[PDB]
Amino acid sequence: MPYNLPLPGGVVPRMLITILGTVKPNANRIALDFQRGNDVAFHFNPRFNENNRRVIVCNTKLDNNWGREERQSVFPFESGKPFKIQVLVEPDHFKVAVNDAHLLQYNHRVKKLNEISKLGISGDIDLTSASYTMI
Ligand SMILES: CC(=O)N[C@H]1[C@@H](O[C@H](C)[C@H](N)C(=O)O)O[C@H](CO)[C@H](O)[C@@H]1O[C@@H]1O[C@H](CO)[C@H](O)[C@H](O)[C@H]1O
């Protein structure tokens, strides 16, 4: 998949990003990439088949190098099924919920949240909407 949600002003606490769509049939991967220039502040990557195991891989890329992965086995996504991803920005971490249920937390590694200018949305999904607001 290919699509970029511009975040004018960058990421900031109290910001809530909502992603609505439907996972494609025979899906293999999904990915949300919060970017800061060439760096990837927060990579959210559900993998549907890694050695016959489903897993959500989260990481950060700094100076073209991926860091220590943070893996989550709770996997709420289903091929062909609609989904909702919510990312709430906190001063210390990104809080992710899927289908209204808390899923995981990713501590900030990239500290200048204001430089996080956009969110790339890709993978095997049919995007309905990608938006944000404060709460
Ligand atoms: C293709 C692939 O999924 N590679 C993953 C694998 O990389 C090892 C070192 C090797 N290149 C291989 O698999 O043949 O394992 C590493 C973790 O040890 C990683 O999952 C590789 O996938 C990459 O993961 C990062 C996030 O950590 C990004 O999602 C990259 O897009 C992805 O290729």
Numbering used by the authors: 116 to 250
What did the study's authors say about this model?
The molecule used in this study is a truncated CRD domain of Gal-3, which will be called as Gal-3 CRD here after.
The crystal structures of Gal-3 CRD in the presence of TF antigen, lactose, TFN or GM1 were determined at 2.0 Å, 2.0 Å, 1.9 Å and 1.8 Å, respectively. In detail, Gal-3 and Gal-1 bind to TF antigen with dissociation constants (Kd) of 47 µM and 4 mM, respectively, which showed that the affinity to TF antigen for Gal-3 CRD is two orders of magnitude higher than that for Gal-1. As the core 1 structure O-linked mucin type glycan, an intact TF antigen consists of three moieties: an N-acetyl galactose (GalNAc) linking with a galactose (Gal) and a Ser/Thr residue (Galβ1-3GalNAcα1-O-Ser/Thr). In the structure of Gal-3 CRD-TF complex, TF antigen is bound to the concave pocket formed by S4–S6 β-strands with the insertion of β-galactose ring into a wedge like cavity. The recognition way for Gal moiety is basically identical to those observed in other Gal-3 CRD related structures. For the GalNAc moiety of TF antigen, a unique recognition mode is observed, which is consisted of a hydrogen bond network including two water molecules, W1 and W2. In this network, residue Arg186 interacts with atom O1 on the carbohydrate ring of GalNAc moiety via water molecule W1, while residue Glu165 contributes to recognition with the N-acetyl group through water molecule W2. In addition, these two paths are closely connected with each other via the hydrogen bonds between residues Arg186 and Glu165 and two water molecules.
